[PDB]
Symmetry: C3
Subunit: 326 residues, 3 copies
């Protein structure tokens, strides 16, 4: 009788686990995703010598059109009115005492310009090789300790994620039926309180990634936002909801901490070409959307049943051999 | 004799389905893809007060260098010569009667600037809190009903998709051998007539995604272009061709319809910093390239044969048990 | 005795191959990746009529903030001070003898502007239809044979790849423990000599992709950089290292060789709107990061053991049938 008992255990396993837990009766399809991101919020940076400068979405989001991976500027160093000319290079490229030390040409690594070959004063104490390039050279030694856009903590990120399961011809948007005009007006995403609001406060996103916004704001950082669409299309499509998880690890001990990049805003003034060089420290938000849809299909159902019978057949042989040797 | 009959059925299944349909004799490798997109076409927008403005690829493609996900501008709202200053904020941030209602600071959500705390006239009828920020504030209430770049319907998208199967060291470009200089000159992609022309008319792409370009043009939209490379490398490499499928669902009832973003073109005029704010309504084309290559390999062939023998062994046991109990 | 001999062979197979080589005792999880790219190096282009122009990271990287897919400019054609006006279109849009040939409107394909309908002289020998658009029209017929930014060969690409295995809560950066401040100062990645230095010389990357930088520099190109994280988390996390492989095939015979795009730098001079049109020929670097982590888990271990017993049970039946029929 114990022989058939195992058969029931195998039958329970197949039905309970393979046929039900793993949804063996369902076929699976990946998704194709499109992510639209809009940032709302504004930061003001009043440099002691420069009047209050405002930074809206058009100025602190890179790229402006948005992408799966986009950068929100949280701190910057600006070299205003850079012009192509001769000037002393940054001392990070070497410090010279006389023109003999400087060699005409271009530095082998991290070149700042075309070295003329004569030493010139970078400042009163330090003399550096004269280069041809964007002048004055960028001085990014002093990152602002309170991030100039630390107010980006309260910026709101609206993630509009349109997914499709092409095999099942099911289109879903992360703005699920629950999300309405009233929610989009005042809702801020919370992992438990508002798990479906597609408006994310950047500080909350960074905090839920296991990171500190104040630390990430100063020198930039990385936050990974995963949107998971695990949907059972055998149920009403309204249950096909996204799951948001935030990822990131900022170790100050780790070398090259944070994220930064340089971009320039070229302009012409007084019939001369100038540019504003910005070393933008910012949090790169990588929005990775993954998921699978499961819809009942007869072909996986039959193969799962066939696999269950095959498992049953193997188990009966194993029980037969077991009883013989024991 | 029925015992061996089932054996043939299992043998037919293994050979016919596992060994041939599923190509069990082949090993499989994913692909690494690079997508190059070039947009050709031009739109002219003659505002009643502003002379005819032309929009070529450098101006309506975001990003200009292109990407797997890029935006073609189909409609825009422009705030010309925005300057950082004091002005009335947009009424969407609140309408005030007196300065008492306004509070100095920054709005908690969708902040437009630094509220000075005194109510000022946004226009004759409506007074809004004075803010410091980009002035005049954007008025995006009236989206142009005929899209300013509705001529983007006839824009041509050239998708240059270079894929590689690194395991098989096979490199393919969507410009297949069939595609030649004469085709690239006049061909427009059609799902059946010209299924290999890599030049796609945007209107056709939107139409084949199940969407209406006129609707998507006004408020933006999303079109997913999937390039599938299902190649059997046992055949000549010339048969490794891409398959293009277009995806998208635009529901006007759905909240936040379409896609839009704001970008600015900063410039200096009369020794003052200005910017042109554009609320760009556009169709975000997400080009997702997937696929797998199958090349004959002895190791999968042996395992498939071994699996077939294993299936044969299980089937014989099942037939044995069947005949006993029946 | 040969019966049990096969049992050992199956036991060796399960333990040796399934349980050990394929790490059946381990569960597997994909990774979520964020790629930060910084380009260092400078190129100078001294046009015979235009003074030496320098190109630093802010000017030759598209997008400036970087992405998984980014473009490093290696050659460009510039149309300076384009303004919206009437002028002769490029002869690629058609050559006319009289105004009768030109038709007012817009060309059906590759439109350059709004044709006024009167033929005008493009140059002394050739007359083309007058259009309204960006003037003077781009003349990209003569790509510079020595690429203007062929010095991009010695540009250094710093790939900062932060990955996470969310199931295992393991965060890794391609700046592995071996990589320190001293390495990041002077190291250049080599496939064998320095396989962990995250600073890549562009010439080396193109060369290791099977391509010639001089060829790719002139007309652009594509290089795929794959970062593979195949990590066994049963071992210390310091062994979770990335593997870099470079992919690309440049066939001059292939149609549409290379990669190029057009972007504009709009500016206002003398109270008039102008733009600098750049046809940027560049190498698009697609950084695809993939990999899987394997950590010992009891559930895969039991199923692998159960599968091994199942394989053992099937093998015993096959040996039984074999001995009967033979
Ligand atoms: N592409 C590159 N080639 C060579 N060195 C690089 C490159 N990118 C960064 N580095 C160097 O690596 C170190 C850390 O890089 P990281 O970008 O995090 O620092 P940083 O202080 O912002 O650098 P920098 O101001 O030099 O761009 C610095 O010494 C930086 O100069
Ligand atoms: N990041 C965000 N934070 C908060 N609200 C947002 C955000 N992005 C969009 N919204 C709001 O969500 C609603 C719909 O968003 P959507 O971007 O589709 O509309 P819109 O009319 O283009 O918005 P807007 O002009 O305010 O950017 C609007 O009320 C908009 O203000
Ligand atoms: N979107 C498009 N629609 C139509 N033709 C296109 C498109 N993109 C490129 N082409 C044409 O395809 C051919 C090769 O394309 P490719 O971009 O490699 O060449 P090109 O010389 O840089 O082109 P162009 O200067 O015309 O942009 C050219 O004749 C080009 O005009
Ligand atoms: C001069 O420059 C060096 C290197 O950047 C810096 O350490 C030093 O403090 C500077 N001195 C002054 C007086 O600014
Ligand atoms: C964000 O939270 C509130 C705004 O409602 C404010 O009190 C706080 O200071 C803000 N923090 C920053 C860093 O701007
Ligand atoms: C973040 O860092 C700041 C300063 O480094 C510190 O005051 C604060 O307690 C940290 N944590 C949070 C949650 O802000
Ligand atoms: C004033 O602004 C409000 C809010 O934008 C608008 O509804 C109204 O039509 C405007 N009135 C005039 C006369 O422009
Ligand atoms: C696109 O098709 C033709 C151009 O050949 C033209 O008749 C039609 O009006 C165009 N449509 C738009 C919206 O520009
Ligand atoms: C698209 O919409 C327009 C106006 O909304 C309508 O006239 C047209 O019939 C629709 N369909 C197509 C295919 O253009
Ligand atoms: C005139 O333009 C045509 C077409 O671009 C070109 O082939 C020819 O060489 C040009 N002639 C001169 C004198 O520039
Ligand atoms: C790159 O290599 C060295 C620089 O160290 C130089 O001799 C060589 O000419 C450079 N090549 C180019 C194309 O700039
Ligand atoms: C690359 O091309 C140039 C010119 O086309 C040639 O001189 C050189 O030998 C080629 N190979 C390498 C490795 O530079
Ligand atoms: Mg620095
Ligand atoms: Mg609005
Ligand atoms: Mg051309």
């Amino acid at each position: 009788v114990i022989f058939r008992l195992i058969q029931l255990v195998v039958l329970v396993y197949v039905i309970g686990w393979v046929f039900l837990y793993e949804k063996g009766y369902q076929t699976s399809s990946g998704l194709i995703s499109s992510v639209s991101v809009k940032l709302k919020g504004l930061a003001v940076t009043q440099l002691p010598g420069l009047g209050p400068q405002v930074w809206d979405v058009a100025d602190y989001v890179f790229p402006a059109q948005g992408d799966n991976s986009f950068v929100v500027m949280t701190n910057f160093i600006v070299t205003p009115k850079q012009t192509q000319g001769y000037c002393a290079e940054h001392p990070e490229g070497g410090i010279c005492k006389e023109d003999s030390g400087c060699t005409p040409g271009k530095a082998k690594r991290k070149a700042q310009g075309i070295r003329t070959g004569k030493c010139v004063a970078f400042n009163d104490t330090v003399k550096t090789c004269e280069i041809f390039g964007w002048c004055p050279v960028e001085v990014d030694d002093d990152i602002p300790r309170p991030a100039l856009l630390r107010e980006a903590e309260n910026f709101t990120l609206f993630i509009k994620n349109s997914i499709s399961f092409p095999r099942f011809k099911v289109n879903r948007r992360n703005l699920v039926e629950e999300v309405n005009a009233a929610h989009m007006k005042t809702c801020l995403f919370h992992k438990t309180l508002h798990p479906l609001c597609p408006v994310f406060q950047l500080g909350y996103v960074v905090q839920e990634s296991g990171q500190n916004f104040s630390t990430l704001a100063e020198k930039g950082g990385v936050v990974g936002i995963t949107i998971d669409w695990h949907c059972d299309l055998d149920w009403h499509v309204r249950h096909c909801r996204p799951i948001y998880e935030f990822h990131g690890l900022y170790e100050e001990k780790n070398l090259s901490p944070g994220f930064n990049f340089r971009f320039a805003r070229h302009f012409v003034e007084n019939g001369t070409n100038y540019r504003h060089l910005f070393k933008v420290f910012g949090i790169r938000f990588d929005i990775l959307v993954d998921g699978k849809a499961g819809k009942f299909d007869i072909i996986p159902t039959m193969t799962t049943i066939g696999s269950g019978i095959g498992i049953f057949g193997v188990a009966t042989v194993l029980c037969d051999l077991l009883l013989l040797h024991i």
